[PDB]
């Protein structure tokens, strides 16, 4: 509509790297996201969801990863924004051998 | 049977009232730079078969 000469592509980068964070590698295989649960009253907790990564959707500010796990009898899937301020640090636990970017089938 | 159907015959006039839009615009023929017959803008001159050089065969 406005036909200015412009790389819409980058303008975005430049307003996205100021909110983008790298993390260990991993691809699947166990992980342990030690995240801080700052929400209890004023008190700032510290939880540690851990287990099988099942997807690495997106990139840039939006990049994230999904981790499946079975807490106390009932399966749980958490989804993390690589730059979610709610995350202190991620760590591989044990590289896995699979053959497809997803794993969904693992929900069973 | 034929559910909708028209209530009266339409005025020879009314017939026309609409047809006031079926007049074909005619080609804007142009003249070749090379055999000079008239060509159709942006296509190969049917007659000599050109488009700067001779594309189609004579």
């Amino acid at each position: 509509q406005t036909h200015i000469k412009i790389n819409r592509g980058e303008l975005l980068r430049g307003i996205e790297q100021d909110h983008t964070r790298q993390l260990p590698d991993f691809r699947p295989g166990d992980t342990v996201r030690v995240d801080t649960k700052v929400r209890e009253g004023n008190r700032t907790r510290s939880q540690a969801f851990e287990g099988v990564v099942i997807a690495i959707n997106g990139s840039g500010s939006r990049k994230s990863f999904t981790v499946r796990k079975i807490s106390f009898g009932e399966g749980v899937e958490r989804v993390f924004p690589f730059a979610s301020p709610l995350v202190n640090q991620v760590t591989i636990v044990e590289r896995g051998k699979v053959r497809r970017a997803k794993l969904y089938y693992l929900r069973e | 049977a034929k559910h909708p159907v028209p209530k009266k015959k339409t005025s020879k006039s009314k017939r026309d009232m609409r047809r006031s839009h079926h007049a074909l615009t005619a080609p804007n023929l142009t003249e070749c730079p090379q055999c000079h017959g008239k060509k159709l803008s942006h296509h190969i001159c049917p007659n000599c078969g050109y488009y700067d050089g001779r594309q189609v065969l004579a």
Partner: protein, 205 residues
């Protein structure tokens, strides 16, 4: 009043403190002032601002002149703003300010000809227990011999979209002057690359 022109560039993620926030990046590109209008000259008070630049080899002899009357430089887009002023040119710097609520208006994406389910919501019907009216199709247009006709406005399939939309009180998250970039909370209407007009809130609490 206060206001500017810009292009919608896209949406993305941004955190503020610990609250993830969808934002829409507008390029309120700088804006030349090509024509001031006073009630004493044009019947009212307003301002003519400009936008996407345009190659002079593409500028009408007439437009050239208009533009010359205020040595500016063919823009290609002009728009007026009311009760506005400023000298020089209009840029968001010192115009909008992080925190302000604004009314980003632009032109809705264009959905062509749409039925009623998708344009007025309707509800169509039965998709199994008998039909030919499956899902969409509006039901009945009215009543009988009385108001033996339909009402001026019944909702039916029309060209949906391609409209002027305004959205109100959207937080102005970050302003990156000198990049005439501006991230706005929430979403603005109109497809990426389209014109968008950000203004002070027309009506804010």
């Amino acid at each position: 009043m206060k206001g500017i022109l810009g292009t919608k560039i896209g949406m993305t993620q941004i955190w503020k403190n610990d609250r993830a926030i969808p934002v829409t990046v507008v390029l309120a590109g700088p804006c030349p002032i090509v024509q001031r209008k006073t009630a004493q000259t044009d019947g009212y008070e307003a301002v003519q601002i400009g936008y996407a630049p345009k190659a002079e080899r593409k500028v009408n002899k007439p437009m050239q002149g208009h533009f010359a009357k205020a040595g500016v430089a063919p823009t290609r887009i002009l728009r007026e703003f009311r009760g506005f002023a400023p000298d020089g040119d209009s840029v968001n710097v010192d115009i909008f300010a992080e925190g302000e609520k604004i009314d980003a208006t632009g032109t809705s994406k264009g959905k062509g000809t749409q039925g009623v389910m998708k344009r007025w919501n309707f509800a169509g019907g039965p998709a199994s227990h008998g039909s030919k009216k499956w899902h969409r199709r509006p039901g009945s247009i009215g009543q009988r011999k009385t108001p033996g006709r339909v009402y001026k406005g019944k909702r039916m399939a029309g060209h949906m979209g391609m409209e002027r939309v305004t959205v109100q009180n959207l937080e102005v998250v970050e302003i990156r002057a000198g990049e005439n970039l501006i991230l706005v909370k929430g979403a603005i209407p109109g497809a990426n690359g389209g014109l968008v007009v950000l203004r002070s809130a027309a009506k804010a609490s």
